[PDB]
Design a protein around this ligand. Structure first.
Ligand SMILES: CCCO[C@@H](c1cc2nccc(C(=O)O)c2[nH]1)c1ccccc1Cl
Ligand SMILES: [Mn+2]
Length: 309
C-alpha cells in the first residue's frame, strides 16, 4: 500500500585527480551513469564553495503548487483563486518553510526521516480528501541576484580563497552551453530553485535532450527520481496510457508541465526508476533524454543548468 522507494542511483566520490575536469569525469562514468539516467557526485571534502548570492536584496514570488491538482480532475466554487503568489525574502521564505514542515509532522524539521516525507508526498499527490498546498521559488534566473557560485564579473567581491571556486570547472557558470550547429556559424545561464517541503518538479527531459548538472548549495535534501534514456519511450507510453485524455494529445513541451506520476506506477509497467537524496554540497547530473522528477525535503537552495559535450 505504502510507497516503495526505487533503488538508489550511482554515487561517485572522485579523488582530487578525477575532480580536475567535469567533462572528462562525466565521460568516464558514462558507461554506468547513462544506464541509470541520473547520478550523484560528491566533491572532495575540502571543496566548499561560498554562497555568493545577494542575500540582502534576494526577493522572489514563488509559484503555488497544489499537490493533488491532477487527482482532483476526477468544479469547486471560485476555482483558480485558491491562493495568490506573494513576495518573500530568503529569510521569510525559510521561516515559512520551516514552520510548515514542523507543523505538518509535529517534529523539528531535521528530525523528520527522508523516507517519511517521501511516503507522505506521494500519498498527498493521489489524495482526494486532503488538499495540501505549498510554494516553490522555481525558475529564478541567476542574472536577477547573482549565481550561488562566485563569478568574476566585477559585481560582487571575491575573497582570495574563493577565487578557486569562481574559476572551477564545477562552477555551473563555467559549464559549456554552446551547442554545435551550422546555424551557430551563420548567426544560457544557470537557474535557481528555492525549495520547501513537498515542493516538486514533474517528469521531463531537457530541451535538445541536453545534459544537465544540478548543485544543492545548502539546506535540506532534494529527492530525485530518474529513468535511463533507453526507457524514454517506455515512460512516454505509460504516460499516454494513464494521462487524462484532455492532456494525452498535448505536445510534450506542454504536457511536461503536468507530468506528475508515482514512480511505483512506472515500475509496475516495467520502467526502470532510480532515486537519490541529494544533500547540500552534492551534484546531480542528468544524462541525455533521461527523464527525471523529484521534490524537496525542506528549505533548500539549488542551482541548475543545461550543458553540452
Ligand atoms: C515549478 C518547478 C519547475 O520545474 C522545472 C524543473 C526542472 C528541473 N530539473 C531538475 C531539477 C529541478 C528542481 O526543481 O530542483 C527542476 N525543476 C520544470 C519541470 C518540468 C518541466 C519543465 C521545467 Cl523547467
Ligand atoms: Mn531538469
Amino acid at each position: 500500500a505504502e510507497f516503495v522507494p526505487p533503488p538508489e542511483c550511482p554515487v561517485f566520490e572522485p579523488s582530487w585527480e578525477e575532480f580536475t575536469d567535469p567533462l572528462s569525469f562525466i565521460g568516464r562514468i558514462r558507461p554506468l551513469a547513462e544506464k541509470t539516467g541520473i547520478c550523484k557526485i560528491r566533491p572532495p571534502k575540502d571543496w566548499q564553495p561560498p554562497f555568493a548570492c545577494e542575500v540582502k536584496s534576494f526577493r522572489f514570488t514563488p509559484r503555488v503548487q497544489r499537490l493533488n491538482e491532477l487527482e482532483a480532475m476526477t468544479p469547486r466554487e471560485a476555482f483558480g483563486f485558491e491562493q495568490a503568489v506573494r513576495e518573500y525574502t530568503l529569510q521569510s521564505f525559510g521561516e515559512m518553510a520551516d514552520n510548515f514542515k514542523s507543523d505538518y509532522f509535529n517534529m523539528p524539521v531535521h528530525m523528520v526521516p527522508t523516507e517519511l516525507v517521501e511516503k507522505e508526498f506521494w500519498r498527498l499527490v493521489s489524495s482526494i480528501e486532503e488538499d495540501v498546498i505549498v510554494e516553490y521559488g522555481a525558475d529564478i534566473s541567476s542574472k536577477d541576484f547573482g549565481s550561488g557560485f562566485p563569478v568574476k564579473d566585477g559585481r560582487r567581491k571575491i575573497l582570495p580563497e574563493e577565487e578557486e571556486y569562481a574559476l572551477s570547472g564545477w562552477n555551473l557558470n563555467n559549464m559549456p552551453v554552446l551547442e554545435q550547429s551550422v546555424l551557430a556559424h551563420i548567426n544560457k545561464v544557470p537557474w535557481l530553485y528555492v525549495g520547501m517541503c513537498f515542493s516538486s518538479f514533474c517528469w521531463h527531459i531537457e530541451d535538445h535532450w541536453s545534459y544537465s548538472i544540478n548543485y544543492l548549495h545548502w539546506g535540506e535534501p532534494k529527492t530525485w527520481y530518474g529513468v535511463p534514456s533507453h526507457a524514454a519511450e517506455q515512460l512516454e507510453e505509460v504516460m499516454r496510457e494513464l494521462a487524462p485524455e484532455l492532456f494525452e494529445s498535448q505536445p510534450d513541451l506542454l504536457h511536461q508541465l503536468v507530468t506528475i506520476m508515482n514512480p511505483n506506477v512506472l515500475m509496475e509497467h516495467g520502467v526502470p526508476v532510480y532515486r537519490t537524496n541529494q544533500c547540500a554540497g552534492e551534484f546531480v547530473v542528468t544524462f541525455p533524454r533521461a527523464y527525471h522528477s523529484g521534490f524537496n525535503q525542506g528549505y533548500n537552495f539549488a542551482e541548475a543548468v543545461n550543458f553540452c559535450t
